[PDB]
Design an enzyme around this catalytic site. Structure first.
Site, short mmCIF file in Angstrom:
data_model
loop_
_atom_site.label_atom_id
_atom_site.label_comp_id
_atom_site.label_asym_id
_atom_site.label_seq_id
_atom_site.Cartn_x
_atom_site.Cartn_y
_atom_site.Cartn_z
N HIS A 1 -65.11 4.21 32.05
CA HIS A 1 -65.43 3.19 32.63
C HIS A 1 -64.83 2.48 33.76
O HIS A 1 -65.29 1.89 34.78
CB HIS A 1 -65.85 1.86 31.56
CG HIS A 1 -66.63 0.96 32.30
ND1 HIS A 1 -67.83 0.88 32.87
CD2 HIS A 1 -66.28 -0.56 32.22
CE1 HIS A 1 -68.12 -0.28 33.02
NE2 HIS A 1 -67.26 -1.26 32.77
N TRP B 1 -73.58 -2.16 36.09
CA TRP B 1 -74.57 -2.84 34.99
C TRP B 1 -75.30 -4.02 35.23
O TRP B 1 -74.66 -5.05 36.03
CB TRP B 1 -73.55 -3.14 33.64
CG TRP B 1 -74.35 -3.35 32.52
CD1 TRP B 1 -74.94 -2.74 31.50
CD2 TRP B 1 -74.84 -4.94 32.15
NE1 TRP B 1 -75.71 -3.34 30.67
CE2 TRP B 1 -75.69 -4.73 31.04
CE3 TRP B 1 -74.49 -6.03 32.89
CZ2 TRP B 1 -76.08 -5.84 30.61
CZ3 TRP B 1 -74.89 -7.13 32.23
CH2 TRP B 1 -75.58 -7.05 30.94
N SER C 1 -68.92 -2.91 37.50
CA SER C 1 -69.74 -3.34 36.22
C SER C 1 -70.58 -4.38 36.47
O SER C 1 -71.45 -4.17 37.32
CB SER C 1 -68.70 -3.31 35.10
OG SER C 1 -69.19 -3.34 33.82
N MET C 2 -70.68 -5.65 36.04
CA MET C 2 -71.18 -6.78 36.11
C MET C 2 -70.80 -7.12 37.65
O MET C 2 -71.97 -7.68 38.41
CB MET C 2 -70.89 -7.73 35.21
CG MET C 2 -71.55 -7.72 33.93
SD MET C 2 -70.98 -9.44 33.06
CE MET C 2 -71.52 -9.23 31.42
N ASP D 1 -68.67 7.14 30.71
CA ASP D 1 -68.81 5.77 30.61
C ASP D 1 -69.30 5.47 29.20
O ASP D 1 -70.25 5.71 29.25
CB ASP D 1 -69.48 4.94 31.79
CG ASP D 1 -69.07 3.58 31.81
OD1 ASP D 1 -68.93 2.98 30.85
OD2 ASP D 1 -68.90 3.08 32.81
N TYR E 1 -66.54 -8.02 33.84
CA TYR E 1 -66.41 -9.04 32.95
C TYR E 1 -64.96 -8.80 32.63
O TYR E 1 -64.71 -7.77 31.87
CB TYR E 1 -67.33 -8.70 31.85
CG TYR E 1 -67.66 -9.73 30.59
CD1 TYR E 1 -68.33 -10.99 31.11
CD2 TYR E 1 -67.32 -9.86 29.34
CE1 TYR E 1 -68.86 -11.93 30.36
CE2 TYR E 1 -67.54 -10.59 28.25
CZ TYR E 1 -68.22 -11.99 28.89
OH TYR E 1 -68.87 -12.81 28.18
CL LIG Z 1 -68.89 -6.05 33.05
#
Ligand SMILES: [Cl-]
Length: 269
Positions: free
Chosen positions: A209, A157, A132-133, A178, A59
């Site tokens: 992260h 995630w 992540s996303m 993270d 993101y």
């Molecule tokens: Cl993200």
């Protein structure tokens, strides 16, 4: 006897180096089909067709966050496309769709006579990565397209950690410290949900992260494991079985777990 094996016999040093054996070139995709932008990295002299890997950021993030994987993986014998999403604020399901659109276009360019990657890709052998996303999206891609050969998301995630259906060999890079997607609420439950695949959990000691992003201080270990995983499972290359499946015995790893990772003559400890 392995039609997919490429390059020289690997060593710990050869996999920890920033540059693999093959000469890499790259180009910008002039009209992305189904995603925002892309850069394609490819070997010029791999010795045969190679598999393709599509990598997605998290993101607000862009190709710069994931760019280092391009030359690192392509130099070992892969075509790699790093993408920007249609919007920096796209969610994991949309990131998965765009990841698969990027793989589709790599396959299209493999058949486009003017393309630098004309005839360089084995379109039956593909893998997914992302941050992540974009890591969540990679696992969505794997769940929905089980013919993918490998997945290796980093600090993943998603709003649900249940990826129990995934049968694709999956390496989860986790970042110990993270605070955005904490390991015990994201990466580790995702890992634990998968009971039908070869899988691995690699937690980077002291990592934020962004611990697997461009410019990180562990490109030796992270790159070695990413390449070995993609080689073992996208190429069926058992010269990489040990590098892929074994505990790397590194001071840079705070947690290592693995399951269904085939190793001949493995110890019992
Ligand atoms: Cl993200």
């Amino acid at each position: 006897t392995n039609p997919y094996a490429r390059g020289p016999n690997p060593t710990a040093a050869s996999l920890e180096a920033s540059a693999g054996p093959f000469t890499v070139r790259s180009f910008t995709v002039s009209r992305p089909s189904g995603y925002g932008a892309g850069t394609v990295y490819y070997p010029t002299n791999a010795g045969g067709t190679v598999g393709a890997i599509a990598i997605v950021p998290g993101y607000t993030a862009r190709q710069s966050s994931i760019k280092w994987w391009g030359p690192r993986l392509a130099s070992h014998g892969f075509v790699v496309i790093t993408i920007d999403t249609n919007s920096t604020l796209d969610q994991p399901s949309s990131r998965s769709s765009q990841q698969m659109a990027a793989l589709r276009q790599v396959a299209s360019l493999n058949g486009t006579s003017s393309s630098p990657i004309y005839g360089k890709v084995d379109t039956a052998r593909m893998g997914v990565m992302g941050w992540s996303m974009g890591g969540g999206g990679s696992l969505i891609s794997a769940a929905n397209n089980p013919s993918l050969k490998a997945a290796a998301p980093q600090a993943p995630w998603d709003s649900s950690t249940n990826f129990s259906s995934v049968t694709v060999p999956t390496l989860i890079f986790a970042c110990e410290n993270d605070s955005i997607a904490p390991v015990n609420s994201s990466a580790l439950p995702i890992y634990d949900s998968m009971s039908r695949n070869a899988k691995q959990f690699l937690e980077i000691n002291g990592g934020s992260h962004s611990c697997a992003n461009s410019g990180n201080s562990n490109q030796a270990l992270i790159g070695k494991k990413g390449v070995a995983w993609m080689k073992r499972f996208m190429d069926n290359d058992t010269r990489y079985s040990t590098f892929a499946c074994e505990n790397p015995n590194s001071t840079r790893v705070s947690d290592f777990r693995t399951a269904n990772c085939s190793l001949e003559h493995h110890h019992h400890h």
